[PDB]
Structure formats: C-alpha cells, structure tokens
C-alpha cells in the first residue's frame, strides 16, 4: 500500500533523525572557542592569466602543482605554465558550452564536458605532436557538470540527469551507474583514498557513494536550496558544500550531521565553488558577488577576502603543495593568488 | 632565460596570435537561444532559419548568427539557463491556438523575463501558428474569455495595423494574445531590455531579417543608453 509505504518511510526518517541527534554530544563551535584564531590572510595576485575570450567555467591543477587547464565558453582548454604564464597547449573544443574540466593525475589526459552530454578525453602526449581526442563517453540524458579522473582508464561523471556514472575509458561503457538523486547533480569531488566520492544535486541533499559497490551510503539533508560545490577535506572524512542559500556547511562522513554553518548575514549572494587548503584550516569559496572569501574551517570566522575579480568567480582550485591558489571568473581572467612574507 | 624557455615563450606568443584571430571571429558573431514548447513549432522555424544542445547557423547581410536550440535535456532549466548570459537575444516561440496552454506559456515567459542572469537580455517573440489561430475564432467553438476573463474590457488598440482580410474579432483576440506578453514585459526591466513582438506563420520566411533588425536595434539601444542620448 502507498499509505503503508509512506508511513514506513516516515518512521524510518524519524528514526534516522533521532539517531543523528543522539551522537551530537558536542559542537565544533564549542570546542573551537579556545583554539587560537588565524590572523587576517591577504593574497596579492602574483600572476594573471589572460587569453580566454569569454567566461571561465572550470579549471583544474596538475599533480605537479605547476600546470593548469581552464575551460571557457569560447570552446578552449588552455594549459598554462603557471610559473611563467606561458601557454603550452590551446585545445579547440567541439561544443562551446563546457561546464567542467579536469586534469589526469599522470598528466597525460584532460577531460571536459558541458551541455553536450559527453565527457571528452584528450590525450596530451602523442607521438604526432598535437593533442587529440582519445574517447567520447556517450550515455547521459542531461548536461555534464563535473568529471574527475581516478586512473588513466577510469573517470567519474556527474550530470543534470539524476545520475552519476563511472566509465571505463578504453572501452567506453558505464561500469556502474548511480541513481539515487532527484535533482540536478552540480558538483563532484573524489576522496584521496580513491574509493569513495560525494555529490550535491540541486535538492538540498549530499550523498556519498561507493565506487566499487555502487550503492549510496549516506544522505545528508541539511541545506535549503541547490548545492553548487563540494570538496573533500584532505583527511577523506569530511566535505564542504556551498549552496544558493549563501551558506557553507561542513559534513563528516562518520558523524552524519553538519558540523558548522558558514554564514555572514551581509552575504545574500549564493556560493559557486569551494576548495580547501592543505591543512584544511582554510575554506575558500567563490560567491556570485564578484569575490571569493577565505573562511576558517574549525573556528568559522570570515578571515580573508579575495577581491580582484570584476565578475562572478566560478571556479577555484588549490595546488597539491598548497603553495598557490587559483581563481577564474566570468571576467575571462584567471588569477593565481599567493600569500606574502 | 635559457634557450628552451625562450622557445617556450615563442610558442606561447604563437598561441596568443591564434587566440587573437579567434577573438576577432568571436566578437564578429552574435549568439541567440531558441526557447519554446513541444507544440510551438520552434523546429518548424528552425527548418526556415542524446545530443543535449543543437546549433543552427545562419547569415544575413554578412553578419554571423548562432542559434542554440536546446535538445535532449530534462524539464528543469534553473541551472543551465545561467549559461546564456552574455547572449544578444532570446527567441521565444509561442503557440497562439492552445488557449489552455497559453497561461503556462506566460508563466514560463515571466520567469525567463525575470531571471537574474537574463536581466539584460531581450526577447524576440515569434507568436506562431497564426493561420491555425484564424480558424479557431472564425469557426469559433471555443471562447477565449473563459480561460481569460479580462477579454471583456479589452478592445483592439488603435496602433494595430492588420493586413486586409481580417475579422475585427480575430484582430481583437490576436492583439490581446500579443498584449498579455507585453504587459509582462513592461512591468519590470528598468529599460535595460525590451520585448519585440512578431506574428509568424509556417509560410513566413522573413524570420531571419526580423532577427537581424531586432539585434541591430538592441545593440543601438544599449550603446545609446551608455551614451545617455536615449
């Protein structure tokens, strides 16, 4: 019976809520009331990477913390030498509307996708000299929004269609399909252990998945509107999501609640891209009001502003050595920020 | 600056030159976005002028025009319509004979007209299937005033310039269907964008010239607003 099933679902939800409430013995704000706050952090735009013709949608660092790929509505994926602001490749794309890009851990491949329901994989180190498409991944029924390489042969995608996918590049099939969400998946971050990953999907819900088993493990429902970004804390036991309700929250995969809630009442604009520093002490988040802010993770104090972008920041990534932080925005620029001593 | 770094700088400069050529081509192109419904006959106008995005190419008076019909996508648009900021115009094709769906058409149009990222984007209405509308009221079995009560107090506006061979009631209804959209448009916009009504049938072919004229008009108006002669 539909009524009986609904009653059982309500009872299960109430039991889950009670179990979640039980384990909340103490709050992060109470524990951090004694930890020393960090001083005002200032970063001063060491480099500016010009060359895109329109808005920048996504960017990704290489595992060497020196190379850099950027996707724009132009139809380009430029790989930059961040140290010298050079340009090593300029990849002409097939569809002008790309909402994501990624850099393979080995440096051999890059990925890109957008409204065309395809994750295109580009091979960078060819015997013929130029860059070429190695594989187009086909099955989705909605705009691709984030792709992240695991190995040189396995990639994971997230689509507007209520589905994430795990592909096998050499063949071109969906080895496992994730079918738990109701809305549009907007963000996707891979845990450092490379066995689990998370996503927020335009329904105030964040869901951790298992790459091997293929079953949604947890389901966090703390927000009020669409989730726009997600990012694993370096431990692999947390993640942070910024949403259209102008709020960031920290979720822990074990506790199964929200730990903190990053909200300044003066902020009415939403959140678009979230990355972390290396120690996890810094939570950098792009906002629609033309700037990015450097939140404090443990203490939850708005302890930095990155105000140099003339338009809305849309992407934000931090290197693997924690020595550079890069932002791109709808002003067609890509600024590589760093601290000063 | 070692020899290999100098050659790397040389390669970056060549990439920059190619990017400048691409930038010339990019500014020389005006982009559009074809919105509508399943029965709107938007594809019919496409015939005249898992793939998630289609693309139509057409040239009028040696000016580039890209039209991006949205294909295999779901119902919701609250996220991928953000991608069409910085677009010259939006084309909204409306069916004028499905009175029981015109209200849903308006309810989509008002959201499109009030979207935050579409707050500087003009819309070119192509009210389609006017010939199919003709019979609906001519051999009238269905009354518009049922779905729309305010058809009572309304009458034909003076500025109407119908072609010969029209029932005055036909014109009064047709311009009313034209007028609710304009009522929606004039409510908000702060003069930053405007709506351009047109009446289109499947046989009309000047749809490219009309887009040419309205895009030129939109650019003229934004330039005249920043110069403040407007």
């Amino acid at each position: 019976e539909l009524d009986q099933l609904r009653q059982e679902a309500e009872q299960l939800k109430n039991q889950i809520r009670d179990a979640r409430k039980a384990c909340a013995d103490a709050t992060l704000s109470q524990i951090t009331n004694n930890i020393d706050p960090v001083g005002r952090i200032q970063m001063r735009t060491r480099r500016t990477l010009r060359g895109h013709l329109a808005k920048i949608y996504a960017m990704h660092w290489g595992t060497d913390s020196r190379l850099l790929v950027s996707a724009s509505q132009d139809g380009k994926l430029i790989i930059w030498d961040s140290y010298t602001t050079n340009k090593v490749h300029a990849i002409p794309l097939r569809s002008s509307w790309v909402m994501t890009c990624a850099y393979a851990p080995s440096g051999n491949y890059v990925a890109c996708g957008g409204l065309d329901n395809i994750c295109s994989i580009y091979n960078l180190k060819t015997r013929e000299g130029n860059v070429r498409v190695s594989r187009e991944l086909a099955g989705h029924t909605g705009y691709l929004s984030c792709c992240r390489f695991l190995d040189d042969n396995q990639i994971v995608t997230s689509s507007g269609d209520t589905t994430c996918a795990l592909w096998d590049i050499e063949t071109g099939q969906q080895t496992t399909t994730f079918t738990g969400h109701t809305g549009d998946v907007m963000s996707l971050s891979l845990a450092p252990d490379t066995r689990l990953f998370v996503s927020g999907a335009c329904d105030a819900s964040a869901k951790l998945w298992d790459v091997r088993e293929g079953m949604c493990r947890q389901t966090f429902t703390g927000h009020e509107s669409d989730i726009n970004a997600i990012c694993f804390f370096p431990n692999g036991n947390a993640f942070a999501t910024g949403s259209d309700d102008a709020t960031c929250r920290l979720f822990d995969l074990r506790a199964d609640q929200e730990l903190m809630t990053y909200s300044h009442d003066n902020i009415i604009c939403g959140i678009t891209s979230v990355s972390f520093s290396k120690s996890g002490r810094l939570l950098l988040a792009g906002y629609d009001d033309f700037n990015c802010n450097v939140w404090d993770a443990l203490k939850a104090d708005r302890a930095g502003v990155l105000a140099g972008h003339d338009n809305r920041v849309s992407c934000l990534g931090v290197t693997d050595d924690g020595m550079a932080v890069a932002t791109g925005s709808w002003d067609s620029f890509l600024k590589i920020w760093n601290g000063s001593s | 600056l070692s020899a290999e770094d100098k050659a790397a700088v040389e390669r970056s400069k060549m990439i920059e030159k190619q990017l400048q050529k691409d930038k010339q081509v990019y500014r020389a192109t005006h982009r559009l976005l074809l919105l509508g419904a399943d029965n709107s006959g938007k594809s019919t106008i496409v015939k005249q002028m898992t793939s998630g995005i289609f693309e139509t190419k057409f040239q009028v008076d040696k000016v580039n025009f890209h039209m991006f019909d949205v294909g295999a996508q779901r119902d919701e648009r609250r996220k991928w319509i953000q991608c069409f900021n910085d677009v010259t115009a939006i084309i909204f094709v409306v069916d004028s004979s499905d009175y029981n769906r015109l209200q849903e058409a308006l309810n989509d149009f008002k959201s499109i007209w009030n979207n935050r990222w579409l707050r500087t984007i003009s819309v070119i209405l192509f009210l389609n299937k006017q010939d199919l509308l003709a019979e609906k009221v001519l051999a009238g079995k269905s009354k518009i005033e049922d779905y729309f009560p305010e058809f009572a107090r309304y009458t034909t506006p003076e500025d109407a310039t119908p072609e010969p061979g029209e029932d005055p009631r036909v014109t009064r209804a047709k311009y009313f269907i034209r007028d609710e959209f304009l009522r929606i448009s004039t409510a908000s916009g702060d003069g930053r964008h405007y709506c351009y009504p047109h009446f289109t049938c499947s046989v009309d072919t000047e749809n490219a010239r009309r887009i040419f004229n309205d895009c030129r008009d939109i650019i003229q108006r934004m330039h005249l607003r920043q110069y403040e002669l407007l």
Partner: nanobody
Amino acid sequence: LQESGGGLVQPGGSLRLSCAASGFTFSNYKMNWVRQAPGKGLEWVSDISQSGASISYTGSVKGRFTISRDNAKNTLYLQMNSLKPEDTAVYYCARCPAPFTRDCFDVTSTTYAYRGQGTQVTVS
C-alpha cells in the same frame, strides 16, 4: 512541506488548504499553488511573495480563490468559495528554488524537489 486540509466538498463549497512548512527560512521564499487534474499535467494557480503584498492569479480562479501567507506560523493558505467541476485535482504547495529572487522556473516540472506531498480535492 506537508500539504493537507482538503477533500470532498459540494459544488460552491468552501475549503481552506494548508501548507505545513518545516524549516527552510519561511520568510524569504516566493511560493506558489500548483494543482494537477486527472488527464492533465501541472499548472500554476496563485503566487504570493515574501512581503504578503504581491499576488498573481490565472484567471480561472482570479476572482474566486485567494492566497495568503502566515510568516509567524510558517504556513501558507488558499481560500475556496466557489468550486466547480473544473477544479477536481490534487493540490501541491510549491516553493521557489532560490531565495531573494523574483524568478521561479521549475515549479510545474515533472519532477521537482521543493513541493508538498499533495492534497486531494474533489467536486461532486
């Protein structure tokens, strides 16, 4: 959104639909009333903004049904006086996707997140 408060009523009867809102910053969201009839899809009906002063109707219920807001109690209302056999439908209480915005896109979509369970209302 626990939508309830309706049911069977005679033609020309009176009903007061209720939209139990639970924890989404009630006083910052545009809200709508959407009903789906047998053999038909979804359709917007009424609209009240966050200020309780902006209203909009369809025309089929324009002079007959009135929408209202209850910020203190976090509740939405819809008053019924003059039903007719064209109103036989389930009723859904909708919420605008983003806060502090004047645009609501996907309220009548086939699948939507911020919508109520549904309340049955039938005319005999």
